[PDB]
Ligand binder design. Sequence first.
Ligand SMILES: CCS(=O)(=O)N1CC(CC#N)(n2cc(-c3ncnc4[nH]ccc34)cn2)C1
Length: 289
Amino acid sequence: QFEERHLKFLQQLGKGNFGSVEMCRYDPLQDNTGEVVAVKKLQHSTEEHLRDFEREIEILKSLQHDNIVKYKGVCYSAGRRNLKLIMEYLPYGSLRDYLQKHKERIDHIKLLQYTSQICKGMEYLGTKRYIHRDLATRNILVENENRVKIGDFGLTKVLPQDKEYYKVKEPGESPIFWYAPESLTESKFSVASDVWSFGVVLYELFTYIEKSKSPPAEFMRMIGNDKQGQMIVFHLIELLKNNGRLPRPDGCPDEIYMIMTECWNNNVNQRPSFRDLALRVDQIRDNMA
Ligand SMILES: CCS(=O)(=O)N1CC(CC#N)(n2cc(-c3ncnc4[nH]ccc34)cn2)C1
């Protein structure tokens, strides 16, 4: 539904290997009245990455929720080459950058509002049997000061109809410091591993994205900054197997840290549900108010 000739590039909003997102104006009348949109494209579009991208687009189109970024459409040139995903543009960028840049004005009650919205989005995913696999504040977007949305679904998988986990090992770097132990050891991803990652997101929020307090920084100190290459993963596994954990962030109340530590249960089946997480967070919010 979008013609590429009418997409006007404004700036880059994000870039990894395999993908990037741009701020563009969609201006079919060419009179500078069109709306600004976000445009995701692949960076090294192998056929495998293209099939994954088409599945990612279908997943996002199937999702309709206040805390999930809105699908708008697709754009392609020359037959169907250089597929692009069109999404609503959210003006405050990623929650990671937003929180870092406005930490002095964002209090704990606001952090818990964001936490509750992220839980509701994840519960919605879970009802569709979708496993996100990449939950992190860098993949959460800020629509306004009172509303956040899960913003990227590049790694999201649909569970088989007969199993409660999905096994996958992607070649390349993996956000291992957000991964549940069974995801590190067995490449097993589930609603429960998303819950483990959600605990890491909650940690991130209460660190306010302070430099040396990031999960990678804290875990690398705990295993020794000398560890190199593959040993990193091995040592992380051993650390988590012995119940090594990220510390309580400065100023974090004990009850919030306790939500984190319960998400970080080595026993997959004893981690809370996203509905229970939302319930506990919302009760704490109400107590604070
Ligand atoms: C895999 C690296 S990436 O470039 O594809 N990636 C997605 C990313 C993280 C998230 N979410 N990103 C999205 C935006 C963004 N900003 C403003 N409005 C928006 N609408 C839809 C996306 C969006 C900014 N960064 C950075």
